[model samples]
Target: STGSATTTPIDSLDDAYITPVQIGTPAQTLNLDFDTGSSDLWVFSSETTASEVDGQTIYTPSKSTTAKLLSGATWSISYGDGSSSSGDVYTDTVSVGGLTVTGQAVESAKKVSSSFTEDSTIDGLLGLAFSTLNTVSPTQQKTFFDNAKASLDSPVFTADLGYHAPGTYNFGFIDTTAYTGSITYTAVSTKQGFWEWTSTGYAVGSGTFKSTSIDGIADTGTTLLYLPATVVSAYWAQVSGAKSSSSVGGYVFPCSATLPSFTFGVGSARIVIPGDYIDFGPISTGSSSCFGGIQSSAGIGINIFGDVALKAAFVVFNGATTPTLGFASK
Candidate 1:
């Protein structure tokens, strides 16, 4: 029989979601960041230098009878935000929601960058991207989804990430109660080890949707929307007092101004990003000035539809043949 699982957000940062997961034989629990941009199931572990591990939970392989060491297996990963981690490897039972995966490779961190050391609350990351993106060195590893999909009724997962609130991630099943409206389907290009797709077009405010195809990826680990510099410039030009602020990082505007809604075309679907979701947060430390949630993808090399864009609707990540994507309003 096929089994499905639904994991709820334990907590949230503006840019991250903390998901409760169980690992090892006896099932030690950890709260990991469920990142879709990269593939690697890693955790802070006993091997980590005590100085590098702030308040993060560490996995003890010795405590699980089912844990087995993977000789010579090592892993290192660096994120777009400059955070990095590397460690040893072990095979164990990893469970999320009600889905249990056996013999999953769990990378346990021995060294972590200061970016990760400072955020002790996050145990590690559960990568939801394709298994080909797995980072284990010497020999690559398979993601939890990759190992679990063989037993799933349908090779599909859905993400319902909420703004400033907890949401849900459903694997191998679609929860119709979690979303409203009809779901729109589109083909995905996995050549880049990412859920990449092309937007049919976009519109600023109430203007009619334009005709354009923009290549981008749906990345849950990223916080804001990143598009071409030209698109960013156009959007800012329409906003009074908005400018490309080198000091503030990206575009900034008066937080009180009525910001226009952004709508993008996905096949026949139109996903509208609300104004409040675009405000992000304050630029100056402890100040009222807010940074625009959208930024230029000048140096990033690709546009990214991060949490700011994904949370606007319910997204079904169908891993069936061709790995399609479906979107619907909530």
Candidate 2:
């Protein structure tokens, strides 16, 4: 069964971030950030130094009448983005909406660095991203999905990102109500944790990437579609009078005119990115401009398909039902 939509507050703990999730009876909600980059659930606690904890909703086990600390187990996690947290482990009854899951793994960071102390609204991150990069040792650790799978309505979890509003990322089950078209499935690679894929080619404006091929990964953690310099330049060439400007960073174009639609081919799927994503805000680099969606990541190695690409479709991480990525129209 699909869960009802609820609006939750998000907080930034320094550089690290967290989202809010309701916990306990009478309903005490703790802020947590859900990350696909790593698998683990953590929250700020009152034990943490007032200075070390910033922007996070501190969960003081001492104050919660229903909280249970995990004997002597402790947890700490560092992200690729250079943010990390460390705290004692605890088993707590957690809830989202009306659904309740007990004995859920929860981390209470005692000491957090300033890097993670910046954003005030970001409480903590929920790691629903993947299990490969989980910081907890397999021996003493368990993922939220592993423990809550039995109670969920389905084995699948889906994320529904809104166009201009805050998007919805759901766990426990896939909600068919949010999608209109038939679901498309993509086989997962044998690799450990990264959601990597191969692109047969690409198409920009109306011109097809006949002789070019690109390979990369789709990351919901990032916000931009990073591509190679040559491919990016080639794509801009096809955008009628698109020019490159410096103000908005990479590419900038007149926002008044309707732009061409660009499509990217992933495996047997061809996904299209609208022109608005391409034409960046502004720049002083050049007279003509390119789209914000297409940026040069010549030396970055991996091409990242960020939020811009994610917002266009309904992405399902079918870990419970099948080891596959399911895509459907929004």
Candidate 3:
């Protein structure tokens, strides 16, 4: 039987956020960001008295009656945006979707900032990203997947976005009902946190990139697919009268002609990004067009296939049994 869950938008102190997950029995919901940039779970505690914690959901151990704290362990997290929080270690019996995992490790922030405060919807973030970035050390440590994996009937975890509405994110075992055939599995590299991959080449319309071998990475945290400048130029060259336009922070192109579909291969699997997904927003300057799915990343790194790329296909992050990743259609 296929079970479905609905995620609702909750009003926080300052921002409009969604409750991505519910933890523990009797259902104490937690507001999670589902950030793929890092893998760590943290929550604001009732002990925090700073006004900055105003809008954020605060977790009070005394209220739970079942909550437990790790007396000696302490943690602090710094995000790329320069936001940070520090807290003490804690443990408690936690569950998700009738799946209970006991002795789960968590953190209770003693001091937090306004950026994290002001949220009243739910307490803390459930990091579904990866385990390499875990902040907790060896002695007192656990991740959501680590605790929840054993309870799941299936060995895989699937993220169904917009299952309820736009920006709505859902998780659980991959719906076997949605399986088309055997899925292609890719072994994760030794990279620290980010999932990286090599691109064989780019295919536009009926044409393909001159070389069949290029390097790229797939990232879910990023909203846009960033491509190498030379490769992006080569792609736009295929569009009729395609000219570059000045974008707000990046380059865009304009064209009325039918754009071509692009495909990239991973091992023997071919992942295609449809034309509609490639139709980028209009640029400010010229009449020339740009690719919606492809953009210039300057020289920071190789291509980055963001969430837009992932949305087109069903992906499984097999962190429970192994570090392998699987891709298939929904």
Candidate 4:
């Protein structure tokens, strides 16, 4: 079976992308953040504290006849961004787009971080990362993709994120028409339970490509692109008034500065990121200085090719026995 769904940016900052998912029998629909960085399909449900629930929709498992408590099963997860959620587990019929999986484990949130509760656009997260990273104890469960991959024509999914526009996530097959140019493939390391790969090199604007390897994960869950401090500094230095601001907590520059495009090599293919995409919105509401979409990953321990980078190209997460990643210009 194959499936396709449209992912929409939650806000102007393009803070996150969410897709509608149906949980349980009668199909309780909720918008869930499809995070490729983590493993665990969790949702805000009746189990969540009323105080922790705000404007987001809550999944009421009790209302669905197919929902069954996964006795003794529990889960908890913390993300790179520091937000977290934890709760008990349930097995139900979960559907995304037209793909359906019976007995899919659904984590019901009992506690959620302040940041998650504050974001009214998303109800919870649907993790697409490797199932090895699942937090369920006693017995770990497979992710939605893992469970449905066998029934799919091909064991692969593609992420086509957009800049301030809706994008599509296709499962089971790659849409040839969705991207421009042929895809360049690279090996992925699943030992760490992430879509980790090594990038060939990068270039700033019209500058020459740097010959070096940068290891990173493709995380759709993350909002910005984070690379080595030296690389980040090189890109920002090209802007007249760009500076690493202590007050703003990141690299900020005059909103009027002419930004340079960022290009990263995938095998022999170089994908270019438009200069406008790097000029993130104002640091603060109504501020004259804007934040840089590419930031230093020094503090994060590992570099991350987040949404900012993913949005610049079409990505394929192949779940073959020997997994690989495919990148193409769009």
Who wins the lDDT comparison? 4
Runs in model 1 deviating more than 4 A are: 1-13
lDDT of 3 by residue, 1-330 (tens): 112343343421112234444443344566665445555677776777666566665666666656776777777777643567777877776554445566676677787655666546546666555666767754536577655666556544554433213333334566656546656777765375655556556676677445465555555544556777877777778767665556444544454667666676656776676666666544434535544556676655556666556655666666644566676655
What CA root-mean-square deviation does each model show from the true structure?
1.7, 4.8, 5.5, 0.8
TM-score of candidate 4 versus the correct structure, residues matched by position: 0.99
For model 4, the local distance difference test gives 0.93
Give every collision pair in model 1. none
- Any runs in candidate 2 off by more than 4 Å, and if so which? 1-19, 113-115, 137-140, 209-215, 228-230, 236-261, 278-301
Residue 252 deviation, candidate 3, in Å? 4.2
Per-residue alpha-carbon lDDT of candidate 4 for residues 1-330, written as tens digits (9 for 90 to 100): 998999999998788899999998799999998988998999999999889999999999999999999999999998887888999999999988899999999999999999999998999999999999999988999999999999999999999998999999989999999999899999899989999999999999999999789999999999999999999999999999899987777899899888999999898889899888887888878999999999999999898999989999999999998999999999
lDDT of 1 by residue, 128-223 (tens): 899898989799999988898878878887888887777888788888888888889888999999999998888888877887888999898888
lDDT at position 48, candidate 1: 93
Scored by TM-score, the top model is 4
Per-residue lDDT of model 2, residues 92-127, tens digit only: 777755556677777777767666687566556566
In model 3, where do residues sit more than 4 Å from their true spots?
A: 1-19, 24-26, 44-50, 53-56, 80-84, 110-124, 137-140, 163-172, 179-182, 209-218, 233-247, 252-262, 275-303, 320-322
Q: Report the lDDT of model 2 for residue 159.
A: 61
Of candidates 3 and 1, the better by TM-score: 1
lDDT of each: 0.85, 0.62, 0.59, 0.93
